[PDB]
Ligand binder design. Structure first.
Ligand SMILES: CCCCCCCCCCCCCCCCCC(=O)OC[C@H](COP(=O)([O-])OCC(O)COP(=O)([O-])OC[C@@H](COC(=O)CCCCCCCCCCCCCCCCC)OC(=O)CCCCCCCCCCCCCCCCC)OC(=O)CCCCCCCCCCCCCCCCC
Ligand SMILES: CCCCCCCCCCCCCCCCCC(=O)O[C@@H](COC(=O)CCCCCCCCCCCCCCC)COP(=O)(O)OCC[N+](C)(C)C
Ligand SMILES: CCCCCCCCCCCCCCCCCCCC(=O)O[C@H](COC(=O)CCCCCCCCCCCCCC)COP(=O)(O)OCCN
Ligand SMILES: NC(=O)C1=CN([C@@H]2O[C@H](COP(=O)(O)OP(=O)(O)OC[C@H]3O[C@@H](n4cnc5c(N)ncnc54)[C@H](OP(=O)(O)O)[C@@H]3O)[C@@H](O)[C@H]2O)C=CC1
Ligand SMILES: COC1=C(OC)C(=O)C(C/C=C(\C)CC/C=C(\C)CC/C=C(\C)CC/C=C(\C)CCC=C(C)C)=C(C)C1=O
Ligand code: SF4
Ligand code: SF4
Ligand code: SF4
Lengths: 216, 31, 363, 199, 67, 286, 157, 383
């Protein structure tokens, strides 16, 4: 619990020079050297905190996500107390198609960091409910949207979709309009789910230029 | 104490379709 | 004509956005049976035209039943005017008649509704040339030699319809059960809300009640099969019951522990119902008047109303009719029992139910 | 005032805490104990005899005798601007020829996919639409179609009072949109004479 | 192209193009209030209440004797 | 002549209830810088009548899981008690008239509790007990206030009574705090602001609902007349209008209490104050 | 006959004056469009001036205003609350989302129009409609109520 | 004794709550959400970057342009686009107008849920004035679609700053007459003081942001610690309270309205002349006169309104101090003209997760106060 109101005057500054220099330049190398077995890959890129800086991205295994997050929360130089979100990105071309992404914020030194774990559809990721209390609903949403199972969760159940909803909508192979639709039936006197029919089907416009160089 | 509801011509004296001075908007830099 | 009605214009697999090729006009579409028929046609992608006499509030429930443009609503229908009937059927290859009456009024008699209008409708249907099917609804107890006036006028109108439109189908179902019916609802209003319920004689006359969804399926099965044109079908459920058995079933289902019915001779019942039948004319029609408080009902109770031997029924349409005494059909009358429907103690089976469920239901 | 009291505390843990310990006297946002007779009378005239309810009552009684902000619709209207995005409409040249040339840019930019266009060449060789539909129940009224149009053919006019009784009345085809433009042309031109200085 | 839009007859340089936009008046707008701006002594309130109640009690005594 | 007098009383009670509910809407609107009902008739003067006629042709919902007799009986009991209390105000000469009206208003609890028992809603049963607890809690302060009032009510022959015609025609200046407690007790009985948290008529439609609201506004008028008789030196039309305006004015400007908050208020503030004032007035009256 | 038919027509006139001047709607504030409905009830437009009182329970409600998008998870609840209102009742669909799905029309989770669940009397267009446009739609609903003739239809049955 | 919990269902009519009580005291609260989940994160993958922008107006529909801001900033960072000075000033000015609108609605809806009806009707006329300010620059009262990549959509019309100054000249009086009904009132205090207390450790552990975080004694404002556009030039104060109360959050929100008024006044006097859009024609569409007179502008107009710009491959997370807290967008780019993945982080989602630990030990009549003081809108909660 940090960033208590201490100065009673208006502050015209953000951070100190030495700690901002350390966070913006040396934090990647520091995390790699202190805990090398936790880190498998690092990217230093365009800085979640501001447009003017650079900030690290740490790749880790699921077997060491919890100790790395505990280290990043409690170490005296990396005090990442706030977990902003947990989400996933689907990459169907990979052997492990999911990347679970964790964003963190350090109120002590005005920093941010990103932590990634790569898993497929049937490999569980350890929960961070004991480390961060917001990890509960975000892991529930990630299970709902992508089908990533978080082991050790207290109550992993769907939170966003419909009550009988099977299927994970944010996967790339799930259709945009889905498989079922809903209407009221006068004969059965109930709201009933039926297979999808569209009065006007969705028109897909393929705009992409055959001279464009940026497509990756 | 400033009063809510100003009276006539003390607020929005001209409608936006009857702007009293013509507008010249820059859309490119001279450089 | 034969089976080109159901095949030639059929587009899509058959849902709400599909096209069946049927343009149908349903007369009496806001009624009890007509609403279910209009729902049955429109859900498969048919255009349904619905003229009505009542206010728009009583017809608004038909607007939901189909996709955009496929439910057509024509208010201020006057069936003594041929222009309204001509406009309502001007694009339809199917006409379905559900217009009927149960009590007489100073503005409308049984012949006006069961005879004159079906005759003029069949004539105007045969004039167009594009109407391939005319489904007319009558009663199972319809007979020209019936003492009840409504059964006799119904049979006379059936004859006029088969005369003017030779391929028109005549449908004669039994008593129809449903949420908004006129059979269990008036019987429950007779078991409760009255000091006593009169039963005509011993109550040993036999009936064959049927479910409303089965009749709605029967209309679509008739429209499929070309052989059923010009025929007469009797629609009755899989069980033959007496009126005493029906009263006993309702008293057991309602959980009423006092039989308030009394068996009376037919002259006594007619003497009771006579003062409110000589004054039925010169009156515009009163609310909450039972259709069982007439001499015609007493004459119907002195006869059997069942499917005749050798007649065409549900089995010729490929339909196994649902049971009326138990199941989904009897669920609405189970809601009117004393205290409420309710589940029970729910504790014998909650033994090996998981943790959060029992606390959720406070068991 | 924003001051606190032991007793006015809304919860139970703080109510139990204030009556068994004097930790509330260290907190600077609390009102201190009265020290003499006159302060006790001021505190009692605060708690009894209200006087904090009365200030709000005096304010609401002043508002009872004040001016009102209600307009008498539909005899009086609100205030809008020439940029207002209302009912879509199709426009003509002063000669009477359609401005639209079936480029399908407004159909491409539409995030709701509320536009459906078909075209072929007219008998005089001109490039014109044969179908131009706007589903007004799919439209989001963003104005992106108005921005994408290079000939000022499709606009969002100044009409907002177009509620109907059937939903089929809100699936506009090309003829109705041209009828809307023929209705609203002078107002649309007056609006565009100002908004062309900015766009 | 911008010269076609904003330029005037006889303009010598591209730096001479006029600009007329929404602007504050010369000197700016005047200053405004931002922060919150704000009874009788309880002795006075209690004295007035005691006076009214004492008059009431005197009238009660008088009407009791008359009754 | 008694039937004629009672019907001639009943006519302005219902006319006044319609005009009270309109005046509440319009005064509440004027405090909020708007207009309130103006369209429905000239100056909105037909709005309560069209509300009543709209509810007249509205469908009566009779739930087929409740007991129909108690469900019908609850708003009838409320309406009958309000009309009887008005008759006790104006067509009585009894010696203990204030005690009669206190007894009638103690009977008014039954409509709330019959509505709570009849309708099969989960939270109607939850809210009826809270509303009954509020009314029951403030009835005792009303009774102790009546005790303080009756210590000084004597007729010409020397007999002490609660007859309304024997009350003095001057305001009771000696009992200003008791008058304020009486007014807040009236606010608590009618479930108005700031005690409007508990509703019990969630299952009622059409004229049963209309009977509920006519009973509520008529009871408010009864309590206003009672307060004007006890403290303001008489019953008058101007005093009825002024006290109603005061109640709407309080409803415009205040938020409401929690359940335990007004329970603590009624059982730790108002009852000891009324009892202490009774002891002081008994000491004065010797 | 002429006199009694004249009386019956005047009974319809008075009943329609009462029903249109006493519409008590029920709020489904599902989404964006609810804020404009709040602005319609506020002091500038003053829905209470036209006799409109918002009611919490469906038993006292005369109309339903669907103001916002309807999802597959919310559709049976909306249908159940609609079924609990007593007759006569009307439904006002407000905004593109309730009208036809709107910007979420091709989603896996949205009902494409509240027409698909409940029948609708007056459709108000916009995303959102202005509060003044909602006033126009409600005045149109009043016009629909004025053309009803219930006792004249009953008299000729 | 062995007292089982009594459970309660709280409202289908779009928050659903399943409470547990041990009498009059709540032991558990479980919110059930997803009744407004329309799948906007899936639908954004099927839109171009300009096409998907009006989805963000419909997330927090009380505060629209602030939702637009973070999506625009996330695109601009990956594109390496600079915004001109006048556009930055316009963005700051309309962001603060948006914050004033949101705080007016939040405080008055809270006080109406508690029982005070008049402040709602008083504040909504001021909301109508600020809606007229939205409409005069974008043509929409709510869903403006005003902020674009590289600047704003249109210039300010002549005569807007004059009227914004005339509104700001009397807004402090409106906030003053608002506080006379609530701040020194004992019923409001007895409803709000010490209800739903949040300490600093619980605030950071439960991912809190915005005026909740400032009422627990934490000096954290994103407009002062990680500034964006011209917020570093703005001079204003951060209000701080220290109880974590409903009452303290109410006071912090009122002071934040005062500070937003201060920033609005500063923006009205320092508004510069110049470009309001970035001059990169391969990202920003040209003017309508330029498009009708030069070939390159017409080509760029055609391509930017059909295919759209291509964002280079990469990722970013960008956040904005939205009036309910930190609103952030996680944008994943593969290189196309469509977002590969667009995760939306909403503060009300994290604030509503706390209702199980905040309502413990409270009564049924305090649940609505807790829900009102968390300042939740279910469009951004249920994406
Ligand atoms: C403070 C409280 C508020 C009250 C004060 C307010 C002021 C008055 C306002 C008036 C009230 C307004 C609304 C009235 C209710 C209308 C009726 C209704 O809705 O149905 C009731 C309804 C019936 O119950 P149900 O829901 O149908 O069945 C549920 C039970 O489980 C079913 O139970 P069950 O099946 O076991 O019971 C059956 C019973 C059902 O009882 C009733 O129907 C209720 C009875 C009282 C209701 C009175 C209303 C009008 C009824 C007609 C009165 C006619 C009497 C004569 C009048 C002259 C006419 C010719 O009928 C019988 O069979 C009765 C049998 C008689 C006794 C047998 C034992 C002795 C045998 C010895 C030999 C026999 C000879 O529920 C109630 O009883 C509600 C009670 C509330 C009534 C008001 C209470 C006070 C009454 C006035 C004061 C008393 C003064 C005495 C004067 C005369 C007596 C009344
Ligand atoms: C118990 C069932 C009802 C018993 C009703 C009854 O006894 O009627 C009474 C009481 O009932 C009525 O009179 C009123 C009838 C009620 C219905 C009226 C509807 C309003 C007009 C008859 O009163 P009278 O003997 O005519 O009056 C005596 C003289 N004096 C006027 C001085 C009281
Ligand atoms: C027209 C309608 C009029 C009413 C409009 C205002 C409605 C206000 C409702 C809420 C009132 C709150 C309230 O009564 O609070 C109590 C104090 O006031 C009271 O107790 C007030 C009633 C008593 C008036 C003063 C009585 C004593 C005066 C002097 C007597 C001795 C000298 C003369 C003999 C207890 O609140 P608390 O905070 O004090 O509770 C102590 C424990 N927390
Ligand atoms: N069990 C049963 O109910 C059986 C029914 N049938 C037949 O099936 C048909 C459907 O019956 P059901 O729906 O139960 O009865 P309903 O009364 O529900 O349906 C009758 C319909 O006909 C309309 N109608 C009646 N008279 C006239 C008239 N003079 N002019 C215009 N329209 C009129 C009514 O409209 P409005 O609402 O305006 O009155 C109503 O919609 C009936 O014709 C009946 O003869 C046959 C055997 C058994
Ligand atoms: C915010 O507060 C409010 C509410 O919420 C608590 C409300 O619910 C209502 C609406 C409810 C109303 C008005 C119902 C209660 C009143 C009724 C039924 C009026 C009673 C009037 C009568 C009996 C006289 C009218 C009858 C006549 C003139 C007879 C006509 C006869 C002939 C023409 C032959 C209002 C106005 C209100 O403000
Ligand atoms: S305004 Fe928006 S929704 Fe309407 S047609 Fe144009 S682009 Fe489509
Ligand atoms: S309206 Fe304009 S943008 Fe749309 S097709 Fe016609 S010319 Fe092209
Ligand atoms: S129609 Fe538009 S404004 Fe209304 S709820 Fe839907 S998205 Fe929001």
């Amino acid at each position: 619990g940090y960033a208590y109101a201490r100065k009673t005057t208006d502050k015209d500054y953000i951070a100190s020079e030495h700690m901002q220099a350390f966070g913006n330049t040396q934090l990647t190398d520091y995390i790699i050297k202190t805990v090398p077995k936790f880190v498998k890959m690092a990217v230093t890129g365009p800085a979640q905190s501001s447009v003017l800086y650079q900030e690290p991205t740490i790749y880790t295994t699921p077997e060491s996500l919890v100790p790395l997050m505990v280290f990043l929360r409690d170490h005296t130089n990396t005090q990442f107390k706030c977990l902003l979100d947990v989400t996933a990105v689907d990459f169907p071309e990979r052997a492990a198609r999911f990347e679970v992404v964790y964003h963190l914020l350090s109120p002590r030194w005005n920093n941010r960091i990103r932590v990634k774990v790569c898993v497929d559809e049937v490999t569980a990721v350890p929960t961070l409910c004991k480390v961060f209390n917001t990890a509960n609903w975000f892991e529930r949403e990630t299970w709902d949207m992508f089908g990533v199972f978080f082991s050790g969760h207290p109550d992993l159940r769907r939170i966003l979709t419909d009550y009988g909803f099977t299927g994970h909508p944010l996967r790339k192979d799930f259709p945009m309009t889905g498989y079922q639709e809903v209407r009221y039936d006068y004969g059965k006197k109930r709201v009933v789910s039926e297979p999808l029919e569209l009065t006007q089907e969705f028109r897909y416009f393929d705009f992409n230029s055959p001279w464009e160089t940026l497509n990756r | 104490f400033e009063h809510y509801l100003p009276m006539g011509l003390e607020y929005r004296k001209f409608s936006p379709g009857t702007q009293p001075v013509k507008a010249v908007v820059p859309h490119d830099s001279p450089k | 004509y034969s089976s080109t009605l159901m095949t030639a214009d059929k587009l899509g697999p058959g849902g709400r956005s599909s096209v069946s090729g049927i343009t149908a006009t349903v007369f009496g579409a806001n009624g009890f049976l007509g609403s279910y028929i209009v729902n049955e046609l429109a859900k498969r992608g048919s255009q349904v035209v619905c003229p009505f006499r009542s206010t728009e509030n009583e017809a608004m429930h038909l607007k939901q039943m189909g996709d955009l443009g496929q439910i057509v609503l024509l208010p201020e229908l006057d069936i003594r005017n041929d222009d309204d009937i001509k406009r309502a059927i001007s694009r339809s290859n199917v006409i379905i008649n559900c217009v009927g009456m149960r009590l007489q009024t100073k503005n409308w008699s049984f012949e006006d509704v069961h005879v004159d209008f079906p005759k003029r409708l069949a004539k105007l249907a045969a004039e167009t040339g594009q109407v391939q099917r005319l489904i007319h609804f009558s009663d199972m107890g319809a007979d020209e030699n019936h003492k009840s006036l409504r059964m006799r006028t119904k049979a006379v109108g059936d004859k006029e319809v088969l005369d003017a439109f030779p391929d028109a189908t005549i449908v004669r179902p039994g008593d129809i059960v449903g949420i908004e019916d006129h059979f269990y609802n008036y019987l429950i209003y007779q078991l409760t809300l009255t000091v006593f319920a009169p039963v005509v004689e011993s109550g040993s006359n036999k009936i064959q009640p049927t479910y409303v969804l089965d009749v709605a399926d029967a209309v679509a099965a008739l429209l499929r099969k070309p052989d059923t044109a010009g025929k007469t079908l009797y629609l009755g459920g899989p069980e033959v019951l007496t009126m005493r058995e029906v009263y006993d079933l309702l008293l057991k289902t309602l959980r009423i522990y006092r039989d308030d019915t009394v068996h009376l001779p037919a002259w006594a019942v007619k003497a009771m119902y006579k003062p409110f039948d000589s004054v039925r004319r010169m009156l515009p029609g009163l609310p909450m008047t039972s259709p069982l408080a007439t001499e015609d009902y007493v004459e119907e109770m002195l006869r059997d109303k069942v499917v005749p031997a050798g007649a065409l029924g549900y089995a010729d349409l490929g339909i196994v009719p649902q049971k009326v005494t138990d199941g989904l059909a009897i669920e609405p009358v189970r809601h009117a029992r004393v205290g409420g429907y309710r589940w029970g103690d729910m504790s014998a089976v909650a033994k090996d139910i998981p943790e959060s469920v029992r606390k959720y239901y406070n068991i | 005032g924003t001051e606190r009291r032991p007793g006015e505390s809304g919860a139970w843990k703080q109510i139990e805490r204030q009556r068994y310990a004097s930790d509330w006297e260290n907190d600077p946002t609390f009102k201190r104990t009265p020290k003499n007779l006159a302060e006790v009378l001021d505190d009692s005239a605060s708690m009894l005899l209200l006087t904090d309810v009365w200030r709000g009552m005096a304010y609401t009684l002043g508002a009872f005798f004040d001016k009102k902000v209600t307009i008498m619709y539909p005899f009086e209207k609100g205030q809008l601007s020439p940029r207002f995005r209302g009912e879509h409409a199709l426009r003509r040249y002063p000669t009477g020829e359609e401005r639209c040339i079936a480029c399908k840019l407004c159909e491409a930019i539409c995030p709701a996919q509320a536009i459906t266009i078909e075209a072929e060449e007219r008998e005089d060789g001109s490039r014109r639409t044969t179908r131009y539909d706007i589903d007004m129940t799919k439209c989001i009224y963003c104005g992106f179609c108005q921005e994408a149009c290079p000939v000022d053919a499709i606009v969002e006019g100044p009409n907002f009072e177009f509620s109907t009784e059937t939903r089929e009345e809100l699936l506009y085809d090309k003829q109705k949109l041209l009828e809307n433009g023929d209705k609203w042309e002078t107002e649309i031109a007056t609006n565009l004479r100002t908004e062309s200085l900015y766009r | 192209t911008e010269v076609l839009k904003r330029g005037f007859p006889g303009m010598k340089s591209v730096k001479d193009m006029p600009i007329v936009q929404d602007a504050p008046p010369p000197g700016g707008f005047p200053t405004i209030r931002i922060e919150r701006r704000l009874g009788p002594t309880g002795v006075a309130i209690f004295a007035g209440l005691a006076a009214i109640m004492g008059y009431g009690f005197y009238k009660l005594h008088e009407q009791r004797q008359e009754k | 002549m008694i039937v004629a007098s009672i019907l001639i009383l009943i006519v302005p009670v219902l006319l006044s209830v319609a005009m009270f509910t309109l005046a509440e809407r319009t005064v509440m609107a004027s405090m909020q810088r708007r207009f309130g009902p103006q369209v429905s008739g000239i100056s909105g003067l037909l709005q309560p009548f069209w509300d009543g006629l709209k509810l007249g042709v509205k469908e009566p919902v009779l739930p087929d899981s409740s007991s129909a007799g108690a469900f019908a009986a609850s708003p009838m009991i409320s309406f009958v008690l309000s009309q009887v209390a008005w008759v006790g105000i104006c067509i009585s000469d009894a010696s203990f008239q204030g005690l009669v009206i206190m007894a009638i208003s103690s009977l008014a609890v039954y409509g709330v509790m019959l509505a709570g028992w009849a309708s099969n809603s989960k939270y109607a049963f939850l809210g009826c007990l809270r509303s009954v607890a509020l009314m029951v809690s403030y009835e005792l302060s009303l009774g102790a206030a009546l005790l303080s009032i009756g210590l000084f009510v004597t007729d010409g022959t020397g007999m002490k009574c609660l007859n309304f015609a024997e009350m003095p025609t001057t305001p009771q200046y000696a009992m200003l705090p008791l008058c304020l407690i009486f007014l807040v007790c009236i606010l608590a009985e009618t479930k108005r602001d700031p005690f409007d948290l508990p509703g019990y008529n969630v299952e009622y439609s059409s004229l049963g609902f209309a009977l509920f609201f006519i009973a509520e506004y008529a009871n408010m008028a009864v309590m206003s007349a009672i307060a004007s008789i006890y403290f303001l030196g008489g019953f008058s039309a101007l005093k009825i209008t002024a006290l109603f305006f005061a109640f709407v004015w309080t409803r415009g400007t205040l938020p409401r209490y929690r359940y335990d908050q007004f329970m603590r208020l009624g059982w730790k503030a108002f009852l000891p104050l009324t009892l202490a004032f009774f002891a002081l007035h008994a000491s004065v009256a010797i | 006959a002429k006199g009694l038919e004249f009386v019956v027509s005047k009974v319809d006139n008075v009943v329609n004056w009462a029903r249109a001047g006493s519409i008590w709607p029920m709020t489904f504030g599902l989404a964006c469009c609810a804020v404009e409905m709040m602005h319609a009830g506020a002091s500038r437009y003053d829905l209470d001036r036209y006799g409109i009182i918002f009611r919490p329970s469906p038993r006292q409600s005369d109309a339903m205003i669907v103001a916002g998008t309807l999802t597959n998870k919310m559709a049976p609840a909306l249908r159940k609350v609609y079924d609990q209102m007593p007759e006569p009742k009307w439904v006002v669909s407000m905004g593109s989302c309730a009208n036809g799905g709107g910007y979420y029309h091709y989603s896996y989770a949205v009902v494409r129009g509240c027409d698909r669940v409940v029948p609708v009397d007056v459709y108000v267009p916009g995303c959102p409609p202005t509060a003044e446009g909602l006033l126009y739609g409600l005045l149109q609903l009043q016009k629909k109520i004025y053309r009803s003739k219930t006792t004249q239809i009953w008299y000729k049955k | 004794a062995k007292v089982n919990n009594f459970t309660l269902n709280f409202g289908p009519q779009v928050l659903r709550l399943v409470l547990e009580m041990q009498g009059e005291i709540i032991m558990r609260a479980d919110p059930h959400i997803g009744l407004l989940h329309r799948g906007t994160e899936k639908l954004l993958e099927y839109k171009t970057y300009l096409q998907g922008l009006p989805y963000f107006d419909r997330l927090d529909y009380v505060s629209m342009m602030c939702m637009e801001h973070s999506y625009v900033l996330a695109i601009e960072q990956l594109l390496n686009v600079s915004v001109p000075l006048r556009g930055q000033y316009i963005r700051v000015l309309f962001s603060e107008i948006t914050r004033v609108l949101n705080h007016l609605l939040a405080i008055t809806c809270h006080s109406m849920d508690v029982g005070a009806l008049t402040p709602f009707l008083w504040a909504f006329e001021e909301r109508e004035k600020l809606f007229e300010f939205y409409e005069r620059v974008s043509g929409a009262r709510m869903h403006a679609a005003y902020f674009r990549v590289g600047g704003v959509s249109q210039d300010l019309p002549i005569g807007l700053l004059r009227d914004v100054y005339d509104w700001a000249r009397q807004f402090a009086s409106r906030l003053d007459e608002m506080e006379e009904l609530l701040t020194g009132n004992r019923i409001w205090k007895e409803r709000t003081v010490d209800v739903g207390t949040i300490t600093a450790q619980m605030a950071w552990d439960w991912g809190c942001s915005g005026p909740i975080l400032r009422a627990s004694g934490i000096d954290w404002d994103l407009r002062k610690t990680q500034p964006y556009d011209a917020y570093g030039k703005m001079q204003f104060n951060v209000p701080i309270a220290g109880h974590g109360d409903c009452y303290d959050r109410y006071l912090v929100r009122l002071q934040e309205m005062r500070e937003s008024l201060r920033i609005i006044y500063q923006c009205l006097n320092e508004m510069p002349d110049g470009l309001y859009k970035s001059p990169d024609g391969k990202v920003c569409p040209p003017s309508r006169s330029t498009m009708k007179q030069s070939m390159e502008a017409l080509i760029h107009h055609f391509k930017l309104y059909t295919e759209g710009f291509h964002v280079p491959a990469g990722e970013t997370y960008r956040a904005v101090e939205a009036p309910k807290g930190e609103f952030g967008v996680y944008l994943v780019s593969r290189g196309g003209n469509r977002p590969y993945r667009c995760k939306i982080r909403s503060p009300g989602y994290a604030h509503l997760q706390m209702t199980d630990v905040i309502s413990r030990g409270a009564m049924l009549a305090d649940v609505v106060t807790i829900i009102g003081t968390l300042d939740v809108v279910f469009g951004e909660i249920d994406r």
